[PDB]
Amino acid sequence: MKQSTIALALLPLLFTPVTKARTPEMPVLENRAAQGDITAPGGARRLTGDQTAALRDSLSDKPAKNIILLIGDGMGDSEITAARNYAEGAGGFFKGIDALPLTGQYTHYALNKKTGKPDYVTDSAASATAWSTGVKTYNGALGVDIHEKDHPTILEMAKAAGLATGNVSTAELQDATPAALVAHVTSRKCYGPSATSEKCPGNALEKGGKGSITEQLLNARADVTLGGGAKTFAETATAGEWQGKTLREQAQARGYQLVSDAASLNSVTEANQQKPLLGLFADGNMPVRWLGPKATYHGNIDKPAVTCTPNPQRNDSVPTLAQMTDKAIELLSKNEKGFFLQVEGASIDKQDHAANPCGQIGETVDLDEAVQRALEFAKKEGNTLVIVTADHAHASQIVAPDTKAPGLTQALNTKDGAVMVMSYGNSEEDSQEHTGSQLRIAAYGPHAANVVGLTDQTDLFYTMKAALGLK
Amino acid sequence: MSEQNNTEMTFQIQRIYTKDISFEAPNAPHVFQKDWQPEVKLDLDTASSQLADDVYEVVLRVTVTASLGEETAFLCEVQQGGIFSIAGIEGTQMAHCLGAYCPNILFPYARECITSMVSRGTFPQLNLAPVNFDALFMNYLQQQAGEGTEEHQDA
Amino acid sequence: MSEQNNTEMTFQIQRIYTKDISFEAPNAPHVFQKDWQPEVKLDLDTASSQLADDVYEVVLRVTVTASLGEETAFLCEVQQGGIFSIAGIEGTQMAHCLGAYCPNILFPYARECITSMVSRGTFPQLNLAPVNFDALFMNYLQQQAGEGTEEHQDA
Amino acid sequence: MSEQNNTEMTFQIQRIYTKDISFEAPNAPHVFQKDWQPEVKLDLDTASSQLADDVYEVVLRVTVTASLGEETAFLCEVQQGGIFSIAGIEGTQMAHCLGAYCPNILFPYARECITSMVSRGTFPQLNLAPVNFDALFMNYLQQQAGEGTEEHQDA
């Protein structure tokens, strides 16, 4: 179960030791706050509640992403590609541009301009350590000698792992790739087909367990939910780069490679210098071949339909909400908090006039609207007929607010001005509940022998001595 | 995590590795008669451990159950862990960092480690597609937080 | 899908795989006396041919020329190829989608392939830093005036 | 190909694979702050099963562990299963051929798997020594050899 075998979904919850990954609310779901848990009964549990008001859509629709390291030279291409995916197909191959000729299909001009000179990129920035555990002893025990850690050298550099050092990641250019017309405010439209998302990817609501035939569950109906660069990706944006190479690299970028380095003394102490005696492998009377029948292309091959299926419900939706706990945390202390470095003043002003949602004067609403809203989904199929155009502002996003919000008076009970650390939260407690320690499964059991019995409590007649692999 | 030398966030990748592996093939020999891509059941989990101030080691557990027809083929599971200094961050860029930047570098390793246990069990080639975690959790923390006027009293 | 298409570029990753791989450690047991991160040159080249209808295969040569001290550590290279479907795009930008974006997809998995072979050679774990060859090959496209009109019968 | 050895009666491996793998490293990010004094446990286990006509199996379960009191460093357990087509011979020959000799020949392959999966946790390598049950088998059988059609080149 779970539509598309080649999936990943998401994750139950974000990383708790970082901080609480949810904003607080006051009017749950309804901004108008109708509020009526029948009277004596409460109705359905609807613990999620506010989650249906939490953005809505933007599954496959990407408003942002990033992935760099300590070095990363780059410049965004002029194409502006809307990617997507649809592997296998299992019918018609493809359609469109019959001839696909590159300027140089084979590299006659070459992408690499020959390693002997700085092509463009040269410098690298990373750190790691190798390993050993040198075993010993042959007779009786095939490894019993505590031998690995030789006396540590000055090699331990500490600063080997430099703390990012970007700077560019704020006051130059952030992602903001769907900066255009959006039929929602944030996400939907701008460019590409957006999160089209053929229905809620529920598979069978939650799990399903066992359904009739594979026609429902993936193997028949495998129209992928966009995936593989679903919205845009590689849109005209600078990653910030910062760590640029240029010709100034010459110190390293001279050439400590191809000619070995400056120490190239023509076979230094590696080729024949290390060997005095030994003259085996002159000939061997043991051939290999296939000693029995074989078939490489027997099977065990298939086309894995690669998809990005998030599924609104993974295994069970837990109460994903952390408000304040302490309460007086809103009042804060000397901290200020109101200055959040740099942030955009929402979408561009005058863009959306609130014509697409609008609303209605539901002062006292009856069950008529509550039930018909289940039926009205048919009306919603037609989309916003009124296409919201990209109506620009005089002030560009970040400069749209004239005055900043001063903290204290703006209590802001979800910012840096917080107390009680994380209010306990959750540690490595439930690690045992994750199928941990319990004998949940051990294949099924012993299938037993046939040609022999082999039923003896002593496995072999050698109590083999350990001490062969340490930490 | 204070204010002093914080500015905004404290990020660095210190180490990449595996913390835990599992692979149980009850029909390991029985695969010979069944040649196709098996039924796959994906489950994930959130495990972490605190090492130091701002240094948290966060783990992506990826459980894969495989079945050829209505019979289990094999079972596989990886915990792609990593030592990181990740704290101080807030607002929109929080979910954008630990939901986009961090998963996209750790994913090929969890994926390959699964595919390796499968390929060591000598089963049909099974490798998972790069999904976008970023927006999925980014949506869940969106509730009118764009205009933080608050308006309680003063203090 | 495939049918019921509209007037807009369509793009589908069909298959991601290694057509060719290399890892060569000439000074291997000599250079294991050196325990630190190898000094790596990040070196990229490409190659390709049409072997598909409305679909084109582009191969990214991700090359790692690493050295420890006054000698070469190892020489690693992976021709990570991919079958990418493209249509609804014209001019130079047409084929530059596979000449930039498509092998940029392949690069995180090229990193993974190399990293594993580095650790198989008992060298310190090498995680390749991401880089856009996009900029370089973009220049090489506008730095060609061959023009066969048609040709292309071979490749 | 067409030179299937088969000395009338023969033991012939058709497949070798890891049926079961297990790695537990609770103290994977704690390995550095803890003492370099682990107690390395080894455990021997052997079982066999029928799969098909003249198609048989023997599994070698090697269990490697390193622990420091209650806090375990790592676990490395590999049920290196092997499909052995064993027939033509009987009695104490086949009893020790699959019961003692087959798991001993699986020991290099179990060593390999353990070495790889522990190194995936970025823990140190362990290249266990060899032991010769081939000599032991022929020695206990008659030493002089003969009757039993041994796998033998021209020598």
Place this chain on the structure above:
Amino acid sequence: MSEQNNTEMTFQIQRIYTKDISFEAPNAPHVFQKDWQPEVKLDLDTASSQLADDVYEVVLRVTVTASLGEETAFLCEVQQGGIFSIAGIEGTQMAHCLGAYCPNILFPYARECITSMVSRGTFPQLNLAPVNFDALFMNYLQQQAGEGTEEHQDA
């Protein structure tokens, strides 16, 4: 009995690793529209060289080909190296260690690389059949047994 020193033939394993790795697949996409019957050709290359005092290197290259004439499917080649501290002038005894034992020790490590590289090219997995390297030297006879010199030739 007093061991004192007695360096009577040194046996110790330093480490095992891949020196060289390769994969080739020109007709890697072209495979889908050919006859699924490749002539799987095997090759084994041999090399050996002393590195340091009592430290020798043994390399066994394995090369697997898959081609149905001119129509080639793929290629894989791994020069697997293993470092073993051996000395004492062992003669016919060390002829076992490097020319029989070590080929079998390096065999699974070379084989995993090949079985991985085909799965990386997204092809049906292929495991190499076992070779009885030591069984040859085992059944035969060493005239002086081994003789590890002995400094004193007395005690």
